[PDB]
Amino acid sequence: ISVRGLAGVENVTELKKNFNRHLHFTLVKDRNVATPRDYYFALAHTVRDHLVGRWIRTQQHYYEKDPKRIYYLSLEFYMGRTLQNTMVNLALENACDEATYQLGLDMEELEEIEEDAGLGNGGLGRLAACFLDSMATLGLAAYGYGIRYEFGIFNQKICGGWQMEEADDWLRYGNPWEKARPEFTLPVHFYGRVEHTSQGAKWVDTQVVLAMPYDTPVPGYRNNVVNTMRLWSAKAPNDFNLKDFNVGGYIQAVLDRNLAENISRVLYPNDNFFEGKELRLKQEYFVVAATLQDIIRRFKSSTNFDAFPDKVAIQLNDTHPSLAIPELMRVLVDLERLDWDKAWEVTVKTCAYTNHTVIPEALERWPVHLLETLLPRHLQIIYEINQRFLNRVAAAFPGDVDRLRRMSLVEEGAVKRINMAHLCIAGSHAVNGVARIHSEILKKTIFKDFYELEPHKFQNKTNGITPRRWLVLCNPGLAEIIAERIGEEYISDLDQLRKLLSYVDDEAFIRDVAKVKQENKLKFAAYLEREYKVHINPNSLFDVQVKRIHEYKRQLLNCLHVITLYNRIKKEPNKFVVPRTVMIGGKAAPGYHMAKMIIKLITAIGDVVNHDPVVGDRLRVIFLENYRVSLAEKVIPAADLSEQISTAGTEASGTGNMKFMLNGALTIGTMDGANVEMAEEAGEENFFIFGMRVEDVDRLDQRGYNAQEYYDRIPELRQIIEQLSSGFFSPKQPDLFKDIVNMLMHHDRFKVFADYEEYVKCQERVSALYKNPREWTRMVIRNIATSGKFSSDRTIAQYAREIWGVEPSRQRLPAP
Amino acid sequence: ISVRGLAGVENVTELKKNFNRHLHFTLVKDRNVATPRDYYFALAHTVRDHLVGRWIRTQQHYYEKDPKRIYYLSLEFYMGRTLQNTMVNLALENACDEATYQLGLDMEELEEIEEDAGLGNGGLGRLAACFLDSMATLGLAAYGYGIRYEFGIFNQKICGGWQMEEADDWLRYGNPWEKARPEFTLPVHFYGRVEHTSQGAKWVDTQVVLAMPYDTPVPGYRNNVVNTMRLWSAKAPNDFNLKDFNVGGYIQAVLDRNLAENISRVLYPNDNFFEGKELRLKQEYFVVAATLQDIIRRFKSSTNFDAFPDKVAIQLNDTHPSLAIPELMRVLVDLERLDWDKAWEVTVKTCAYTNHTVIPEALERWPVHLLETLLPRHLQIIYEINQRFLNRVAAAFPGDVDRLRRMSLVEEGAVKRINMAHLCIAGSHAVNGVARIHSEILKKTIFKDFYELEPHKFQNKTNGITPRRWLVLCNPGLAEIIAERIGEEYISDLDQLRKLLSYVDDEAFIRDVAKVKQENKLKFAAYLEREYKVHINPNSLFDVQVKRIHEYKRQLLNCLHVITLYNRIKKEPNKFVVPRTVMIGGKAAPGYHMAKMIIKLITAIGDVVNHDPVVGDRLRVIFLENYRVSLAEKVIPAADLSEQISTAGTEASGTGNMKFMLNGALTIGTMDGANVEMAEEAGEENFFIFGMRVEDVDRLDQRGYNAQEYYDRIPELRQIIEQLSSGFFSPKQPDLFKDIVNMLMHHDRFKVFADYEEYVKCQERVSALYKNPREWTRMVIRNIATSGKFSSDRTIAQYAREIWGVEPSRQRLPAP
Ligand SMILES: Cc1c(NC(=O)NC(=O)c2ccc(Cl)cc2Cl)cccc1OCCCCC(=O)O
Ligand SMILES: Cc1c(NC(=O)NC(=O)c2ccc(Cl)cc2Cl)cccc1OCCCCC(=O)O
Ligand SMILES: *Cc1c(COP(=O)(O)O)cnc(C)c1O
Ligand SMILES: *Cc1c(COP(=O)(O)O)cnc(C)c1O
Structure with missing residues (x-):
């Protein structure tokens, strides 16, 4: 057979007993009633067993060496199946193929039973997935952060030649690759109002939703590195989502919990198109808010945030996670009590933005009334960011009044809107296109004014x-x-x-x-x-x-x-x-x-x-x-x-x-x-x-x-x-x-x-x-x-060196 | 130490490595970051491992010997924690106590981390739980059937002396004892209408909800018997709950799935009190419909249903599962095409009813308009059952016109209602009270007329x-x-x-x-x-x-x-x-x-x-x-x-x-x-x-x-x-x-x-x-x-002999 690895005598034997261990103890089935689905699970659990040893040491390794961490924020991670990919990166394919053969099963038949993790729409989501694979293979201390949708991209059916959409219940039978981590659950706030006190602003009377993380291993190619993809799930608190008393119904209060939890229910099926729905905005803040808390907690361990950018790099996959900028400022200024300017310096130095398209209908322009209601404090911060940024422009191009309105993060008109793309350029130290021609179009067209203001920010990183x-x-x-x-x-x-x-x-x-x-x-x-x-x-x-x-x-x-x-x-x-x-x-x-x-x-x-x-x-x-x-x-x-x-x-x-x-x-x-x-x-x-x-x-x-x-x-x-x-x-x-x-x-x-x-x-x-x-x-x-x-190994090496400030390494981690 | 079993040298050693196996592979944790919660799970998985071997042989045993099966239907199963109880019935307590001691942990501290399975209100729910334990210990081929509520009885908090209710999210961190069985998922129908054709009635245009079963082991006391408690979860189909096209919104259609799934969301917190809410009725039919399909499928394996009562016994814990009677008739007559009379004979012979109270406000009287809308066919069948039953009364007490209206399953008045208790007595071959005095009150008061009609039906089975x-x-x-x-x-x-x-x-x-x-x-x-x-x-x-x-x-x-x-x-x-x-x-x-x-x-x-x-x-x-x-x-x-x-x-x-x-x-x-x-x-x-x-x-x-x-x-x-x-x-x-x-x-x-x-x-x-x-x-x-x-061993032995027609046995099953 090919170069899908070695089919060692000891390892094929070991594999087989572990397959049987899981079929018995894990699936509680016996060969006489085991369904092909049971067989697929016994195999998946057996293969997953081989990387936990490495997963633990990789993470423990990063704690000990404490390198600069790369955080890849994306509302999409188009992963697909993960059994075969894991076998490949671990060089287990042939061994597994042989062992299942001896057990009288067709490994390829079992592979077809795994459900695709369709947590993406197309190119943008798949890029994030390819990138995760490359960052592991290049030995980078990287974490993929996203939302764990229980319903990914809909399943397409053709009826009478027409497309019919149907729910993608990919978790129906369970996901053997993920693992809930209910110890790092975090609270995320919504709505409320802002109280301006003696020593700072306060975000008050907010509705709380909990964010529960689920970790999925991302194994590097044959280097014993296993990074982590952390996906957040929305959970309602058991108190106020029941405790806000004075009539309504106890049963109803419990049923109504599926209102705060709807945040991580489904992926928006729009590819290169913007829909300003509140549920979308909630998902965006939700992933940003939870991720940042987790990032700062990790850093506090590793309080002068001057070193923050030296240990943290957060990459924005499009403007979807753009609220990370005003949210990082909120935490630093409101909670950590850093002065605006010090806070901004830190924020710009840790954030980088990636543009994915130039079509206008794909651009995120969030109505101000929406941000005003859902995230009052962030709107205040965005106005303040805009204020100081436009002052920079005016100072650079005195009298250019049209350029001022063109570059504003706030768009006037029918309804006022916030241009999320302008927000990202202002608060990122690097903005990149995804192909040489696209990158040039950004400088010549769409973001020309921004390019003239700070040429050093714009780069290119051709996809891979x-x-x-x-x-x-x-x-x-x-x-x-x-x-x-x-x-x-x-x-x-x-x-x-x-x-x-x-x-x-x-x-x-x-x-x-x-x-x-x-x-x-x-x-x-x-x-x-x-x-x-x-x-x-x-x-x-x-x-x-x-x-x-x-x-x-x-x-x-x-x-x-x-x-x-x-x-x-x-x-x-x-x-x-x-x-x-x-x-x-x-x-x-x-x-x-x-x-x-x-x-x-x-x-x-x-x-x-x-x-x-x-x-x-x-x-x-x-x-x-x-x-x-x-x-x-x-x-x-x-x-x-x-x-x-x-x-x-x-x-x-x-x-x-x-x-x-x-x-x-x-x-x-x-x-x-x-x-x-x-x-x-x-x-x-x-x-x-x-x-x-x-x-x-x-x-x-x-x-x-x-x-x-x-x-x-x-x-x-x-x-x-x-x-x-x-x-x-x-x-x-x-x-x-x-x-x-x-x-x-x-x-x-x-x-x-x-x-x-x-x-x-x-x-x-x-x-x-x-x-x-x-x-x-x-x-x-x-x-x-x-x-x-x-x-994508070439792409990542370029991001690492020209944006993140980290050196890729093809060094094998010290065995499992 | 006490008689919590033997702390064998080999078994304490074995226990310890398995605890460590799970802590590593299952919890993916290492001793330096393991939380007490992780320790509790490693122990639970290790203990659960000891009964799967027996669980499999017990079930395989019942298939081979094919004894009469006992089905205990209850909308409540007040189980509580299950780790210690399992250790006790398996004689593992001391071994486990010793092993965790050597691993430097306090087993009692770990036990307090397990969440109570509070799927019951009080006495009725706890009885079902004690009964399951006794049926296993007495070696009966028994199955507990219920609903898997994701929210059990609310957690009580006292604020300023007042009670505050808060959601019982017992599944938050997962349940190591249950196991989903997505292979036996079944469809349950609601609403629709009845079409009367040439060869029978048809229940048509119904809304479908899927029932997914979850099995939990019920180990007998030191006899190597492990029975099953099967709990149903409501799941929405991915088609119609999206496929019923012509505008509405794709996102909304997906979010709206939490409407069919609300059926198994929460337990009604009423103890000895009836609330005629539609959601309650839905839960009642849901558990009945799914359970019966599963019961008949098992029987079809083991089509003359004459032998059905010889292989099947279904016990109704109160009137909550009473729809089992008209539902069994529906299946037999509509689907199996048995004549009414043959169908009724079978139904009465397999069903038995247990009364739990005499207070009127606890009595289930379902408005006819509700049954009319949700379960049209069942209402027709209940009317037909009532018709033939009252004819029996009239024949027995000629001219006693008041007795006729007193015994009707249909109550006239403000709004017509169906007396579920009368339904149960008519379609059960045995009705029992739960204590000698209660049993006598039933005959002298509440069900006097029924007792006069068929004295042989009424029995007593003092609780235990x-x-x-x-x-x-x-x-x-x-x-x-x-x-x-x-x-x-x-x-x-x-x-x-x-x-x-x-x-x-x-x-x-x-x-x-x-x-x-x-x-x-x-x-x-x-x-x-x-x-x-x-x-x-x-x-x-x-x-x-x-x-x-x-x-x-x-x-x-x-x-x-x-x-x-x-x-x-x-x-x-x-x-x-x-x-x-x-x-x-x-x-x-x-x-x-x-x-x-x-x-x-x-x-x-x-x-x-x-x-x-x-x-x-x-x-x-x-x-x-x-x-x-x-x-x-x-x-x-x-x-x-x-x-x-x-x-x-x-x-x-x-x-x-x-x-x-x-x-x-x-x-x-x-x-x-x-x-x-x-x-x-x-x-x-x-x-x-x-x-x-x-x-x-x-x-x-x-x-x-x-x-x-x-x-x-x-x-x-x-x-x-x-x-x-x-x-x-x-x-x-x-x-x-x-x-x-x-x-x-x-x-x-x-x-x-x-x-x-x-x-x-x-x-x-x-x-x-x-x-x-x-x-x-x-x-x-x-x-x-x-x-x-x-x-409850005495209680069960009496049910077995005087109602079910089965012989209890204290014989150890052939090892694990
Ligand atoms: C039932 C059973 C088994 N069963 C088992 O391993 N496992 C289970 O039943 C099982 C599965 C999942 C869970 Cl959570 C709990 C149990 Cl207890 C194994 C061998 C024989 C057996 O009886 C014969 C069944 C019919 C076979 C045929 O028709 O060819
Ligand atoms: C991180 C880590 C470990 N980690 C591990 O086993 N497991 C995990 O991290 C872990 C846990 C759950 C899941 Cl799904 C995936 C992983 Cl990869 C073990 C030993 C050392 C270690 O580093 C030191 C942490 C701080 C210790 C202290 O402060 O005393
Ligand atoms: C690679 C990939 C895409 C992106 O394709 P383009 O032709 O660049 O638009 C979309 N969907 C899936 C399933 C892919 O694998
Ligand atoms: C035994 C039990 C009950 C029933 O108690 P009674 O005094 O018979 O009403 C109720 N709740 C719990 C928690 C129990 O264990």
């Missing part, structure tokens, strides 16, 4: 993905043939993949690379019929676009091409065309009407295309249901063509693009986000780039975008629009897609028509290359061998 | 208590000296206690019995200052009345005596009186105004009495806060005088009275409930009986009860009433107790004044006996030696 889950875990076959030639060191040193460049002409390697891709496609084609049922051809080109559904991601542009391919086949049926299976998957936010309309369009196209006899097996349109982390681990290794076609300047970075590049897929995309650095790394000749560049989009906006022009000059495009309009794809409901056509023609913010011509032309070129297996594979090798820059 | 928790566990010192003389066999054969009768004149035994009582009092006096703080004299007579607060229990009568004692001391200060520490404890239902007023009266008396310098240490009035099972295990072994003074004919049986008798307390009480059989067993000369007999109460009711008469002829009583009226006990609020005085004088349903004179006179006699230590102790020995009849 973990090669452990995204290669070794999901594509062992590819990881193995690579290791056969260059060794195993690249798993924690992805740059070494370049060494594969010297095998680009190796006949055996070319054959191998092509073989694992073919095995991956056969396995996925099988899984498709197994769990979803309705056949696909594994010899065709696997064209896949998987990511959340968004107008800016342009799944619609993908559809136009699919319809074009179909129309061409119907025009010349007996002409040869490279067979394709185009797969589009992704979830739409429940309130995003357009995004839900696009899913129906995709399934509607498949209904026509998939049953046309003249088309045969040359073209299949499949919608990948419930796209999530665990599903990504299956499709990506099986893809040939990765679609990254967002309008230039809208996708901050993207990460799925990197996952595809590492797994042997070629990329067709625009010069957007990280696509630019990937093409730059692999060489543009090895990439399928097309469409407008940022500049072209801007030129078009100056003169004005008119979709009619494109409709008028392109007969193929016109034909498609008239097919949608006449009900060709919706016979029973001829006007079903009027909203889509209307939008494309009159309010297309992402100019889908503008990139149509260059897109289908470019798609022609990928089909030409696919016809030449040998050359396709050689280009694949150029992409894989050149993907090393996109490992 | 388990000698394991109620003697060996809470009073090891007494259990030991008893064992020193007559051996250990009496623990599971209480009748052998009679053998102690021959030591009634033994000088050494008399001294010993008196010594353990004195040690028990010193320990309790200590615990009082430790956890509640404010001293008491351990040399005084410990006069205690602990039970729920009720007008019928007459804590008020107890107060009158206390005030009388105080008034006499103030009249003749330098006269000698036997010192007393009277302790009154118990919880009042939150909506029971009078009961809450009585608690304030008790604390108000203590405020005056406890600070009067002339009184000195001769009289202390203490209110025992948060009386519960774990607290009972502490006070009872320390009591000298047990107060069981309910008005004759109101306390069906009582069980606390038995606990006191087994632990060396003398009883002062009325000829009520089981008090009659206890005095009968011990000899009236060894009991302090007083007041009216049932007959006297009836005579008084014929002529009419006038409290003024007693107030007029008794100067001491008058003086007390004038003290309450003038604010002597409430200076700042002189009219604070007007409600109590008003009630006593004009609407005393329990004639407190009528028993006043005989009560204080009798109290004089107990003080006279206490002055003679030797004789007091000899009378104590007569009570203890004669308590054997009150073991």
Whole structure:
């Protein structure tokens, strides 16, 4: 078997008795009534047993050495399953595979029983998860802090072609990886009012909610380091949530506890979109307030807070945890009694902010009346921060009255709002973009004024993905043939993949690379019929676009091409065309009407295309249901063509693009986000780039975008629009897609028509290359061998050195 | 050390490593950061490990032998702590005590950390718990079925003398004894409507709630038998509780799941009182519906249901689970398609009902409109059952038109109601009272008409208590000296206690019995200052009345005596009186105004009495806060005088009275409930009986009860009433107790004044006996030696033989 570790004689034996120990004592089951679910749990408990020894010493180690601690605050942690990942980082995979084999069980069958920890929406949440893995592997004293939602991202079901949402009760059967720590429970306050006394302000008459932490281990890759991800759960106090007497009902008071506990009930399913609901604000303060208390308590142990920034670094994943800034000030000034200026100095020095997008509708602008009611003291502090900051601007740009209102944290208008992004820039010593182009756009556009004020704050840290889950875990076959030639060191040193460049002409390697891709496609084609049922051809080109559904991601542009391919086949049926299976998957936010309309369009196209006899097996349109982390681990290794076609300047970075590049897929995309650095790394000749560049989009906006022009000059495009309009794809409901056509023609913010011509032309070129297996594979090798820059180990090493002030280390911790 | 088992060399060693295994692997803690709570859990997991082996074989055994199964349905199971009880029934106590000692820990300190499983209100819930223990010890294939409330009986706090209720979050830190079984999850229906088709009625368009079972082991006493207590939890389905589309909000739909799950959220805190709230009805159907499905599934394994009653027996603990009757019919007729008559025959033969009280306000009378809306089909079935039953009556008593309306299950009037008690009698083959006198009152009064119709149905089964928790566990010192003389066999054969009768004149035994009582009092006096703080004299007579607060229990009568004692001391200060520490404890239902007023009266008396310098240490009035099972295990072994003074004919049986008798307390009480059989067993000369007999109460009711008469002829009583009226006990609020005085004088349903004179006179006699230590102790020995009849092992053996048709067995199951 592969390099999933050694199957030692002693350890396979030990593993088996421990599996049986847990099956008996833990699951209280006996082999005659044990269900596959029981088997999965016995295995999970057995594997978890192997890292507790290390978990304890790692934490005890940090207490003894007392290094600078890194706190990664995020309202999202898209973790996925954790059994296999743990086996991989502990080098237990083969041993476990062997032991379960002898016990007569299929480890892979058991792995499929674990529920995904879908505590994230998409890119932002998955980045946090990849980062945690990298920080452990690089031996950093890092803690992931978030909310323990009992309901993560909804499960997507397709009914009559429409998306149906259903509760993700991932904790239903229990979570063997987490452990409640009811000793560090903390109180969080809400509402109340502010009393200004003789020696300071006081936040009074507040409603209290308790925060209970749950620890989940985050093991580094084979270095015996296990860090901690601490997730907070909301709990109602038993007193006032019953003790505020004088009629109401005792039963009711108890039932009403599910009001304070609703705070950690569900994750908001919005990807790159802001909804100013009070429940959202409560979750944001809740995670911030509890986390900070825990951070300061740890520090008080390790009162001159002058050294605080030397021992603490808190990274803000977007503006979601932005209240950490005014909350840190509140504690320092109100409770610790530090002078404003000393407090501010400390705050700015420990906080750093990461921007994830430039679309306005994703920007957090919280109405003042909301902050006024829920967090009165924080509003006062934000006003004071704004006051002193604007004074700084005025001093720097005397008389520039418009710049003052442009930079204010407070926005005037219909209703006053607080620009959380401006808050973060002012109270952070570092602000970074997630890709070189996005980082430049921030300085030239969105945060230009801030950049002019303090240029030193703005940096870039191109995103990355973990090669452990995204290669070794999901594509062992590819990881193995690579290791056969260059060794195993690249798993924690992805740059070494370049060494594969010297095998680009190796006949055996070319054959191998092509073989694992073919095995991956056969396995996925099988899984498709197994769990979803309705056949696909594994010899065709696997064209896949998987990511959340968004107008800016342009799944619609993908559809136009699919319809074009179909129309061409119907025009010349007996002409040869490279067979394709185009797969589009992704979830739409429940309130995003357009995004839900696009899913129906995709399934509607498949209904026509998939049953046309003249088309045969040359073209299949499949919608990948419930796209999530665990599903990504299956499709990506099986893809040939990765679609990254967002309008230039809208996708901050993207990460799925990197996952595809590492797994042997070629990329067709625009010069957007990280696509630019990937093409730059692999060489543009090895990439399928097309469409407008940022500049072209801007030129078009100056003169004005008119979709009619494109409709008028392109007969193929016109034909498609008239097919949608006449009900060709919706016979029973001829006007079903009027909203889509209307939008494309009159309010297309992402100019889908503008990139149509260059897109289908470019798609022609990928089909030409696919016809030449040998050359396709050689280009694949150029992409894989050149993907090393996109490992989150590189990203983290840069954050560590350029933002946190800590030195990464690949030193093995002193055994378990 | 005592007979808490052997401290074997191998087992103490084994215990210690397992304690450390769990502390490390399970609690992921290390000795340097382990909290006492961690230590308690490591011990609990280690002890639980010892019974899983037996739990599995016991259950597998019942599958193989396939005996008749006993199902005990109750909405209450007052369990208390379970660590010590498990150690006792497994004979692990000494080994565990030794092992933790060597590990440098105090086992008793760790035991106090466990949370009480307060899933009961009082007597009814505790009986179910004692019964489960007896059924295991007698080797019966029995299952306890109930609801897993996340909030049990509220925790009682006394503020300014008033009771304050606060949520009992007993699961906060987890429950090491339970185990979720998500494989046997079942659906329960609500609402909907009934469609009458060609081949039967159909219950349609219902709302579904899922029932998830949690198993808790119930170990027999040293016989290697471990039965199961299965508790249901309400869970919302992820579909319709989200899938019923067409606007509303996705977030809201998820938050609204806490609406179907509220069913198992909290226990109704009513003791002997009926509240017709919909939530209560839902809990009742919920436990019934899920339990029955589980019972039939088990049977289908073991379709002629003719044999059903031969393999199944379901005991109804009060009318709370009465819907089991129409629900069993529904399943048999609607789903299994059995003819009505065959179905009814089966139902009556498998169901038995236990009545617990005769007070009207405790009777369950559910409004028809409620059953009509929530359970439409059941209402139809109840009407049909009533129809056929009344036809039986008419045939038996031709022309007796008044008897017909008296016996109907349907009550006419303001609003129509369903008499659940009448339902139970009609569909059960056996109806029993809980004490000989209560059982006779049922036949002569309340259910006279039913008794005349089917005399064979009515039986008696005097309640009992388990000698394991109620003697060996809470009073090891007494259990030991008893064992020193007559051996250990009496623990599971209480009748052998009679053998102690021959030591009634033994000088050494008399001294010993008196010594353990004195040690028990010193320990309790200590615990009082430790956890509640404010001293008491351990040399005084410990006069205690602990039970729920009720007008019928007459804590008020107890107060009158206390005030009388105080008034006499103030009249003749330098006269000698036997010192007393009277302790009154118990919880009042939150909506029971009078009961809450009585608690304030008790604390108000203590405020005056406890600070009067002339009184000195001769009289202390203490209110025992948060009386519960774990607290009972502490006070009872320390009591000298047990107060069981309910008005004759109101306390069906009582069980606390038995606990006191087994632990060396003398009883002062009325000829009520089981008090009659206890005095009968011990000899009236060894009991302090007083007041009216049932007959006297009836005579008084014929002529009419006038409290003024007693107030007029008794100067001491008058003086007390004038003290309450003038604010002597409430200076700042002189009219604070007007409600109590008003009630006593004009609407005393329990004639407190009528028993006043005989009560204080009798109290004089107990003080006279206490002055003679030797004789007091000899009378104590007569009570203890004669308590054997009150073991729940005797009760269960009678249920088994006279109702269930099964033979108890004290055979050890084939090792673990
Ligand atoms: C019931 C039982 C077992 N049972 C066990 O280990 N465990 C449990 O039952 C069990 C499971 C969970 C919890 Cl919390 C408590 C228990 Cl006691 C093992 C072997 C045989 C057995 O009887 C035969 C069942 C039917 C088998 C068949 O149909 O093939
Ligand atoms: C932190 C730690 C340990 N810690 C451990 O076992 N366990 C944990 O920390 C722990 C506990 C629960 C969970 Cl889910 C996960 C972990 Cl990793 C043991 C020995 C030393 C140690 O450092 C010193 C702490 C301070 C001691 C003092 O002040 O006396
Ligand atoms: C990697 C990943 C994403 C982010 O994908 P992009 O194409 O960058 O938007 C979203 N969802 C899941 C399940 C992922 O694994
Ligand atoms: C035994 C017991 C009861 C029942 O007591 P009675 O005096 O029969 O009403 C109530 N509560 C607890 C805690 C008990 O242990």
